[PDB]
Symmetry: C3
Subunit: 191 residues, 3 copies
């Protein structure tokens, strides 16, 4: 890892804090999409893509990688990762504070695991998925590529969620889902 | 910070544990409301108000401050606070273990952030609000003064909750609220 | 505590990670039920029972103890336990990462407190209960023996849950329960 890091980025400042926690000395924000090809003339410091949106993040990931940059993982020092878990190396994965990833779980490229999310044993979290703060995946859960799990949501044991699906804020997934879908929780009601 | 701390206080013992975690050597409980004025003859050790109730806490805060005491913040060493976040100095704020406060968030006087609550980037948490264990505020959320967010509750991004409002246990706030209100979740049903 | 530990066990690998975190050097898996009596001829390293099921765990606990083994607690170094809390010594209790147990709470034999669960002040968690990831018990909550609290569930202050009860995933217990029961939350609905 380099002493400096480029961040393609409000998510930018948060990723900057995580980079600094890891021991990066300086962060350089590079938010421009057009003319990105010219950035290849810059020193090859580590790169990170601080975009919460899964589809944009993947697009930028592919463009940055093609320009000769290494897209590192940003992993807060307080994140706990089982030695038997697999976190894809140099794959633009964000792992925020107090995230716990248990034995034999697998985290794929471009995933966001936000603060205090928990990935229990033997889970697979598909590429460019977004696991929001406090969201929890029980044992043997398979989350597809490009999924979104809302704040404080959860997925019960042994369940699969198909690619491209959305689990709402506070929602509890209770059945296997072989087809893409949108799965809603219950909103707070004014009384 | 002084070597000893007065705690105006079951919440008292919990605040004592946090004070000891910070490195305070001794805690002195001072629970009396009547004759509080006489306490001004005591050595001016740091003070904290360990009352979960927002209105009582503010009353005591105002009375203690008028008697020549410094009301410190009690912040567990495991709480993570972005360097760009603002936590009002010496303002009787409680920040419990494993609380995370992200970039550019602001925590006002007398707030309680209970264990494992999360305040995402650019939030404002209004004075004497009570954020319960596991409650999570997404990015750019504005919580009014004197609000209560129940256990495991959450507030979706970019939302404001008006002064003096209550969000129930497990509830998910989904819309802006310009007027005070009470917002309920769904209770566990016996089957 | 011994340098090695026997684990009666996917939960096995997870408990192994916790044992290694505590500083145990080697873990030996001993999953056989029949012929367990013969294990008494083995060196008396510390023992742990890594079974999520409350009734099986108790059965094995009783059998292992009768064979002259010490069943230790496995407590992740990141778990925070108030000095005034009581965690029954050498009682096969599992306390996972980022669990917080506040002042004067009591954790009984054979309990599982899974990752990021919170036990607030003055709680009692009954023997061989299973508190799932993210589940939170407010102040003065009494959880009976052999209870299950689902992922991200919670129990409001001052409530009792009778022996042998189940609180579902995402569910919020709101009333005292003097009789055993099953208490359900709301499932995510496909839209």
């Amino acid at each position: 890892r380099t002493e400096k890091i480029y961040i393609y980025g409000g998510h930018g400042l948060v990723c900057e804090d995580v980079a600094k926690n890891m021991g990066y000395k300086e962060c350089i924000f590079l938010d421009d999409f057009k003319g990105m090809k010219f950035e290849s003339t810059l020193p090859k410091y580590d790169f990170f893509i601080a975009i919460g949106n899964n589809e944009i993040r993947k697009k930028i990931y592919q463009k940055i990688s093609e320009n000769g940059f290494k897209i590192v993982n940003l992993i807060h020092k307080s994140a706990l990762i089982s030695p038997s878990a697999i976190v894809e190396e140099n794959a633009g994965i964000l792992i925020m504070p107090y995230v716990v990833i248990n034995a034999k779980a697998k985290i794929e490229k471009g995933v966001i695991l936000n603060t205090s999310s928990v990935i229990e044993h033997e889970c697979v979290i598909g590429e460019f998925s977004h696991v929001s703060v406090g969201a929890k995946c029980a044992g043997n859960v398979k989350i597809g590529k490009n999924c979104f799990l809302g704040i404080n949501s959860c997925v019960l044991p042994n369940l699969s969620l198909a690619d491209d699906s959305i689990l709402g804020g506070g929602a509890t997934l209770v059945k296997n889902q072989d087809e893409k879908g949108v799965f809603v929780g219950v909103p707070a009601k004014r009384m």
